[PDB]
């Protein structure tokens, strides 16, 4: 359906970002990865990332569309899976499960943005 509201995908996110976080499988990535604990990490990974750097980052108003924050959770999944030795291994299970839980979850708060984007330009004022 038709949507009108631009600024709604923020607490869309927030309340998106709750669930995973209460979610287990995000347990590995809540915070950024310890090169104590994986010290060849950044050999690997050029941009680490993690889910509170995103919640941070949205909260400080540091992104301008849902579509931002939709790239940089993206980067948290391809991270694990760069790094992970095996597409068996439990980490890269863990990102697989809750990517296609985000994706089903994003889907509505993408279309909505684009529909208010839309209906804005339909609206746009110029004889004034």
């Keep these: 359906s038709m949507s009108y509201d631009i600024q709604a995908w923020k607490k869309q996110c927030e309340e998106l970002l ?3 976080f209460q979610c287990e499988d995000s347990e590995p990535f809540r915070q950024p990865v310890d090169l104590l604990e994986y010290p060849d990490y950044r050999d690997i990974i050029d941009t680490p990332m993690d889910f509170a750097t995103v919640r941070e980052t ?6 301008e569309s849902p579509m931002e924050l939709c790239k940089d959770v993206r980067l948290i999944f391809s ?7 095996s597409k068996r291994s439990r980490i890269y299970s863990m ?3 809750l990517s296609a839980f985000f994706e089903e ?15 804005h330009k339909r609206n746009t004022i110029t004889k004034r």
């Design 58 to 63: 949205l909260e400080a108003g540091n992104y």
């Design 18 to 20: 709750n669930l995973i």
């Design 105 to 119: 979850h994003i889907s509505s708060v993408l279309s909505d943005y684009k529909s208010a984007l839309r209906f």
């Design 95 to 97: 990102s697989n499960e």
């Design 79 to 85: 991270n694990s899976k760069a790094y992970t030795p």
